[PDB]
Write a protein that binds this ligand. Structure first.
Ligand code: NA
Length: 246
């Protein structure tokens, strides 16, 4: 059971003007160099870059999505974009290059009226993929607070388990998932201060630094392919190395 015990210094890949956005790469065992970007809290377009030099030179192809996205909690896995359909409790899986979009409903989830999972990034849902599964982090519309995690079946894009962490969303700045462990940041998004073992269904101790900057953190996402954290911090696109104890 490998645990993160510290985070290394960030490497900045690009500075853009936009406060909020995402930048994402493939994590499946698919040596794909493409980068996908969204800008702002909502929209219908994704920018596809062929590789990092393309991103550095603002050379993209615009992809029109079948449904508007909201927030900065998306993920790419197996040539597909997973994202929150704005104004609904629907999550979309949009497969690139063929458009076979699938959807699923999270009936018990907050999704509008600024009752955010992560207020700092105006995000209601955070899709995350890692070594142990495909996950969706969200907050309960039953109590308006508790952070829940759905574990998905990849083939059918359906929810197998709902996992209640019992952690209040008011205490969470953002989060990521690595080796089956949910790591949650403080409200200032400077330290990881809470963790939860998603397979054993139990809290586990975690307290370590993420970063020194308190600039607005829009996106925080683990990639199992290179074991780095990807972030968007007030227009600064960063990569952090991660240190596992095992
Ligand atoms: Na996140």
């Amino acid at each position: 059971e490998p645990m993160i015990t510290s985070i290394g210094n960030p490497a900045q890949v690009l500075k853009v003007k936009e406060t909020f956005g995402t930048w994402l790469r493939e994590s499946a065992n698919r040596s794909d160099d493409r980068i996908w970007v969204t800008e702002h809290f909502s929209g219908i377009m994704v920018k596809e870059f062929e590789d990092l030099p393309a991103l550095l030179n603002s050379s993209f192809t615009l992809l029109h999505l079948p449904h508007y996205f909201h927030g900065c909690g998306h993920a790419v896995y197996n040539n597909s974009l997973y994202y929150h359909k704005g104004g609904s409790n629907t999550i979309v899986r949009f497969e690139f290059g063929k458009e076979t979009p699938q959807t699923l409903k999270l009936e018990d989830a907050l999704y509008f009226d600024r009752k955010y999972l992560f207020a700092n990034s105006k995000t209601y849902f955070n899709i995350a993929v890692d070594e142990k599964g495909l996950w969706i982090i969200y907050a309960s519309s039953v109590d308006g607070s508790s952070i829940l995690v759905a574990q998905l079946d990849e083939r059918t894009f359906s929810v197998l388990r709902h996992i209640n962490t019992t952690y209040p969303k008011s205490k969470a700045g953002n989060a990521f998932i690595a080796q089956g462990i949910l790591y949650v940041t403080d409200t200032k998004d400077t330290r990881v201060t809470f963790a939860f073992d998603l397979l054993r269904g139990k809290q586990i101790n975690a307290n370590f630094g993420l970063r020194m900057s308190q600039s607005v953190l829009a996106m925080l996402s683990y990639n199992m392919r290179d074991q780095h954290l990807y972030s968007w911090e007030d227009g600064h696109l960063m990569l952090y190395p991660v240190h596992f104890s095992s």
